[model samples]
Target: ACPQCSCSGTTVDCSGKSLASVPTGIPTTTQVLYLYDNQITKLEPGVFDRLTQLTRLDLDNNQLTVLPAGVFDKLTQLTQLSLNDNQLKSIPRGAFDNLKSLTHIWLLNNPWDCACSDILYLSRWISQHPGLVFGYLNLDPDSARCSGNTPVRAVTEASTSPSKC
Candidate 1:
C-alpha cells in the first residue's frame, strides 16, 4: 500500500494527520519522517526501529506527556529531533543516550519542571555534551520558570546546582 501517508523516497510526510498513535510498518528506507501537528499522545517501544537510516524526526506540536525508556535507542543516525510544544515534564534516563550523532534538539515550549526527580541526570547529560545544540528556553531556572508559580525552572537551567534538584 501507500503506507497510508505521503512518501517521497526516504522522506515521509505525515504532518497534521490527527493521528492518535503512530502508524506502523514505516518504510525502513525512511530517512526523514515528519509526525508534526498530530495528536499522538504516546509512543510504543521500537516504533522507529526500522528507520535506522533516519537522520531527522520531528515530533513537535503533539500531545505527548512521556516517552518509553530507550525509545530512540536504535536511531543512532538521528541528527535532529524536535519535541517542543508538547506536554512533556521530564525525560527518562538514557532516553537519548544512544543518539551519538544528535547535534540539534528542540525542547522548548513544553512544561518542563526543574524540580523533577530526574533533573540532575538530565542536566548532567546536556552539560556533558556541550557540542549538542539545543533550542528553546534558556538552561537557566531564572528564565524557564514552571507554571503554577512552583519556583521551578527547566532542568537545563536548574541543573546549574545539581545539589538543589
Candidate 2:
C-alpha cells in the first residue's frame, strides 16, 4: 500500500508502481523522485509546492499531455528533469521559469507539437540553453534530436508564431 516507496539517502524510488497519481505521504526531504513507467496523465497544480528539496525528478514514460501552471516553480534546487516518452505535445511559456539551477533536461520521444504559438517557448528555451539538452551532451554528440530525429532547436526555429488565422 501507500505507493510502495523505498527511500534511502533522500532518494525515493517509486518507479513502475502503477500509480495513478503522485502519492502524498512521500518524505518531504526527498532529493530525487523517480516516477517513470506509470499511468499518470496530468499533474495537480501546486502538488509539489512543499518539496523544495527535490533536485532531480524523473517523470518519464507516462501519459502526460499537459503541465499545470507553476507546477514546478517551487523546486528551486532542481538540477535535472526527465520528461521523456510521454504524449506531451505542447508546454506553455513559464512552465519551468522558476528552475534556476536546472542544467540538464530530457525531452526525448514525445510528440512535440510544433504549432507556432505552442512551441515558441520550448524552441526559444532550448536555443538559449542548448547545454541543457541531455541529447547534446549524453545521448548523441552529432546533434540534439527530439522524436524521430527531429532536431528540437532547428525544427522549432523554422515555425513562426501565428499572429492570426
Candidate 3:
C-alpha cells in the first residue's frame, strides 16, 4: 500500500512524517514529492527508478549522509532539488550529473567534510554548471572545521581550500 499521505493534484506531501525509509507504492505520476524532515538515512539505488514524472524533489532535514552514485539518473525531467539540513559530508562524483535539467539545488545546514578531496571536487562541479544555481550554503557546513578547528567555509564558497583543507 502507498504510504498514508495527503495528495493534491500530482504532489505528494510526506514531509515531517518520521518515516525511516522511502515509502513504497508512491504514485508513478507524482510530479512533486515532499519528503523532508524525516529519519531517512540512506537512499537505496533504484529507489526512485520509477518516478519519471517527478520534477521537484525535496529531501531536506533528513539523516542521509551519502548518496549512491547516479541515484537520480533516471529523473531526467527533474529541475528543482533540495537536500538541505542533512548529514551529508561528501557527494559522489556522478551523483547529480544526470540531472541535466536541474536548475536550482539547495545544499546547506549539513556538516560537509572538506578535509579531503571528495567535497572539494564537487564544489568545483557546482561551479562548472553554468545553468545550475546553487540554492544556498552557510557556515553550518563548515562549523565543525577540519575538526577541533574552525573550518573555512566550503561548499558555501566557491574556490580552492587552503585554510580548511
Candidate 4:
C-alpha cells in the first residue's frame, strides 16, 4: 500500500511513486489529482467513481493500455486530462460519454492502431467534439504509427479522411 496522500486543500499530489495501482485513500473533495509517473497499468471500472469533483487529472507517463468504459462517468467537472506517453492502442467507445466539461486531452506518443475499425470511433468522437483539443497538432496523434511497415502516415490525415482507413 502507498503512503497516505496529503490533500493540500483541493489538490492531491501522488506523482513519481512506484505504485502499481491507483491509490484509494485520496479525499473525495480532490479537485486536482496528480498520479503522474506511476506504474498503474489498469483502472478498474469504478476506480475513480468517487472522485466526482475532479477538475484536472494527470495520468501521464504510466503503463496504461486500456481505459475501461464509464470510468470517468462521475467526474463531470473534469476539464484537463493528460495521458501522454502511455501504451494505449485504442479507446473504448463512450469512454468519455459523460465528460461534457472536458476541454484539453493529451494522447501523445501512444501506439494507436490507425485501422478503420480501430480508429473510426475516436475519429468520429473527435469530429463530433470539436471543442476538445488533443496532443500537439490539435487532435493529431503524435508518434501514433500505422499497423505495419507500409509507411508511417499522419493520424490527422486518416481521421480527416476516414474512408482511407
Candidate 5:
C-alpha cells in the first residue's frame, strides 16, 4: 500500500516501508526528510542531490550496515541526523566529514564492533562541539574524573583509528 504522507513545503515521510533505495526526485525544497524504519541497506551515491536544504534527517532502525563515504556530504545544511540502531560495524573517518552545520548526531544503540581506534575519532568530533552530540551513552564528562571506576578510553583527537577489530 502506498504510504500516507502529508506534504508541507516539500517535506516528506517515507517511513515504515521497504525503500531499498532513496526515492528519486525528492523536491529540492525538502526540509524534514523522514525515511525511518525501512529495509534500506545502502544509500546510492548522490541520492539527496535535490535535498540540499534538508535540515532534519531521520534514518533510524534500518538495515544499514555501512554508509558509503560522503553519503551525506551534500546535505550541508542538516542540523540533526539519526543513524541509530542499525547494523553498522565500521564507519569511515570522513563518513560525516562535511556535515559542518550539523548540530546533533545520533550513533548509539547499534551493532558497533567497538573498535577503539576507529570509533575514537568520534570522541574528538563530539568534544569539539560539546552541545552538538546528544545521545544516551557511557562516554561523558570526558575528563579523567572517571578514574578508579573504569578506564574510559579517551576518544580524543590524538587517538589512532581502529584498524580492524
Candidate 6:
C-alpha cells in the first residue's frame, strides 16, 4: 500500500478481479485505485471511507446504480473521480460534499436522467461556481429508467424546497 507512485513498493490492481466491496486495511499512502468491469451496484455505503490522500479513482464500466450522498467526504484531496459508463440513476443533494480539491468528474456514456427540479438544482450548484457544472444542465436520468416507474420524475418537477431525508 505504499504511495510512492509505481516507483516504490508493489501497487494494487483490482481491475476485473470482481471486487464487490472496497478493500480493507489499505495503506495511508496508497494513491490510485482502479476498479473497472465489475458487478458493483449502488455505491450507497462509505466505500472509500478514509483514504484522505487518495487522488485518482477509476470506477468505469461497472453496474453502479446510485452513489451515496457525500460519498467523497473523506477523499477531500481527490482531484479526479472517473464514473463513466455506469448505471447511475441520480445523485442526491450535496453528494460531493467537501470535495474542495476535486476538479474533474467523468460521467459520460451513462444514461443521464434530466428532470426540471433536479436540473435546476444542479443549475444552482453550477451558478454557485459560475460555470463549473459543465453540461450538467442537460442531465437526463429520469428518462433512462426502463420501467418508467422512477420517482425521479416527481423530483424533476417539484418546485418546493428539498427535504434532507
- TM-scores of the models, in the given order? 0.80, 0.84, 0.78, 0.78, 0.74, 0.65
Q: Residue 97 deviation, candidate 4, in Å?
A: 1.7
TM-score of 4: 0.78
- Which residue window of length 10 is worst by lDDT in model 1? 138-147
Best by TM-score: 2
| TM-score sort, best first | 2, 1, 4, 3, 5, 6
Rate residue 19 of model 4 by lDDT.
75
Which is better, 1 or 4, measured by lDDT?
1
Pairs of colliding residues, candidate 4: none
lDDT of candidates 1 onward, in order: 0.73, 0.76, 0.72, 0.72, 0.65, 0.57
Candidate 6 has a TM-score of 0.65
Enumerate residue pairs that collide in model 5: 117-161, 117-162, 118-161, 118-162
**Clash pairs (backbone) in predicted model 6:** 112-140, 112-141, 113-140, 113-141, 113-142, 114-139, 114-140, 114-141, 117-156
Which digits, one per residue and each the tens of the lDDT, describe model 2 over residues 1-165?
A: 223777778898889989778787767788899989999998887777888999999998899988887788899999999887788766668888899999888887777766446666776677777767775249431243444356656664545456511
Candidate 5 accuracy as TM-score: 0.74
Residue pairs with clashing backbones, model 3: 145-151
RMSD of each: 4.4, 3.1, 5.0, 4.7, 5.2, 6.4
Worst 10 residues of 4 by lDDT: 143-152
For model 6, the superposed segments whose C-alpha errors exceed 4 Å read: 1-11, 116-165
Residues 132-156, model 3: lDDT tens digits: 5453542133332332243433345
Per-residue lDDT for 5-61 in model 6, tens only?
222332345667676755556566657777776777866477677668788777887
